[PDB]
Each structure stands twice: as structure tokens, then as C-alpha cells.
């Protein structure tokens, strides 16, 4: 019906500023250290 | 008629405020601490 010259345009529904736009194509119209290895009792203990 | 209730609530808040600023060093000036004497182990350790 609406198809024009081999083009299948059929599958279409047919029934501030106020600009006007064209329809169908819109455009303007833990762990804490332990004592060892912490450097005491490694220089100490006079007993 | 509300005056005495105001007194009661003021007294409550002021009690809390007085308690907040209290420290034992001020009220108990003769509070004890952990004094000790210099002993033999100090001298042995110094020599070592």
C-alpha cells in the first residue's frame, strides 16, 4: 500500500522554548612483635 | 508552673557537667605511684 517503487516502507504505524520537530524524522521544522629478633635479649642478660 | 521542672533538668545537666571535669589527681592529691630503689641488678647491667 505505502510501498513506493520497490521500497518496503509498509511496516510503519498508520492511524523554555517550544520548538517544532517533524514527525517520522525528528528535525526542527593482626600480629604484634614478640621479644626475639627485636634487638633485646641479644645485647643483655647479665645472668 | 514549669519553673521547678526547669530547675530539676538544669540540675541534672549541671551534675553531669561537673562530673565530666573531675580527675583523681585533683581530688586525691596524695595518690600513690610505683617508686623503687636502685639495686645491684642496675649496676651489673651497666657493667655488662
UniProtKB/Swiss-Prot annotation, chain B:
Subunit-level organization: Component of the SWI/SNF global transcription activator complex. The 1.14 MDa SWI/SNF complex is composed of 11 different subunits: one copy each of SWI1, SNF2/SWI2, SNF5, SNF12/SWP73, ARP7/SWP61, ARP9/SWP59; two copies each of SWI3, SNF6, SNF11, SWP82; and three copies of TAF14/SWP29.
Additional detail: Present with 217 molecules/cell in log phase SD medium.
Functional note: Involved in transcriptional activation. Catalytic component of the SWI/SNF complex, an ATP-dependent chromatin-remodeling complex, which is required for the positive and negative regulation of gene expression of a large number of genes. It changes chromatin structure by altering DNA-histone contacts within a nucleosome, leading eventually to a change in nucleosome position, thus facilitating or repressing binding of gene-specific transcription factors.
Cross-link entry Glycyl lysine isopeptide (Lys-Gly) (interchain with G-Cter in ubiquitin), positions: 7
Compartment(s) where it occurs, according to its Swiss-Prot or TrEMBL record: Nucleus
Name of the protein: Transcription regulatory protein SNF2
Residues of the full protein shown: 537 to 584 of 1703
Organism listed in the record: Saccharomyces cerevisiae (strain ATCC 204508 / S288c) (Baker's yeast)
Amino acid at each position: 500500500x505505502x510501498x513506493x517503487x520497490g521500497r518496503x516502507x509498509x511496516x510503519x504505524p498508520x492511524x523554555x522554548x517550544t520548538x517544532x520537530v517533524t514527525x517520522l524524522x525528528x528535525x526542527x521544522x593482626r600480629x604484634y612483635l614478640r621479644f626475639h629478633x627485636x634487638x633485646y635479649x641479644x645485647x643483655x642478660x647479665x645472668x | 508552673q514549669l519553673l521547678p521542672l526547669q530547675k530539676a533538668v538544669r540540675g541534672h545537666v549541671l551534675q553531669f557537667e561537673w562530673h565530666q571535669n573531675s580527675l583523681l589527681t585533683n581530688t586525691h592529691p596524695n595518690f600513690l605511684s610505683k617508686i623503687r630503689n636502685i639495686n645491684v641488678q642496675d649496676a651489673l647491667l651497666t657493667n655488662q
